[PDB]
Amino acid sequence: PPVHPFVAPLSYLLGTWRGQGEGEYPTIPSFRYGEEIRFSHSGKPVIAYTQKTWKLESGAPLLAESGYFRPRPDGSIEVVIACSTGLVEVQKGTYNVDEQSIKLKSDLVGNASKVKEISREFELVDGKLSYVVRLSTTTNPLQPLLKAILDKL
């Protein structure tokens, strides 16, 4: 199938991405994990997202996401992601093409234990994927929670 015009200005994003990342929150200490993000499409104005985490040494698998990225010309964007942890997010926000980012905040965080707002950012910096999740809980403001870097497979 061929790139739909909506999906085509995020065509760099496309393919397997793979490196490792680093979590830390006021509640907990630096811990490190490998990552694997895949962006795809089959003609439609929607980009599939899957992701998986895994322990470095083992490295037995940790967490795992699967989603739909749904871009539009006016530079705005919507994104729904399910997590094995048992959340679902519907994130609204924008993509600029010069910089080659996407910037989301949560709109609806669904079946959330203590989770409030969650903001994901995927930018291409220096030809690698820089992906960050900021978090808020019932006790702590939005802040940098994770930060992963990834390379083109």
Added chain:
Amino acid sequence: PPVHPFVAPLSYLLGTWRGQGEGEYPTIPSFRYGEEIRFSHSGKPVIAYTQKTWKLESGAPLLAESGYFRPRPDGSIEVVIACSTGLVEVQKGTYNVDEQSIKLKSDLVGNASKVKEISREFELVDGKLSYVVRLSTTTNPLQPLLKAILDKL
């Protein structure tokens, strides 16, 4: 890696499942689509789930959904899903080991315009995985939309 004990009762599901479906609804007459379904896992208390529909001759892509099941040892199962429509569900239910069945019913369908409810039902009927989808809208009660019957691959 080993089938979490919490998950072991549902092992009939693990693997890829090909078939066809059909929609009828009061506003859309009969139709028919190709359709795959695969459940996997990864040594967690979770079965991963992906599903994609095509056009029978084309078979050009139609829709994908993905997510995650959490069975409990108590009967309850709680599912999450993101759909290429651009729409998430929370599903919560109660499965069944020798009726071999997983009945679900939306506890939250985010990012919907006009959907109000969705249930799903995943069940083995004489060897093939039958999938029944039902929906209510602003204007329609909780009735059938999608039926599909899939053969283990």
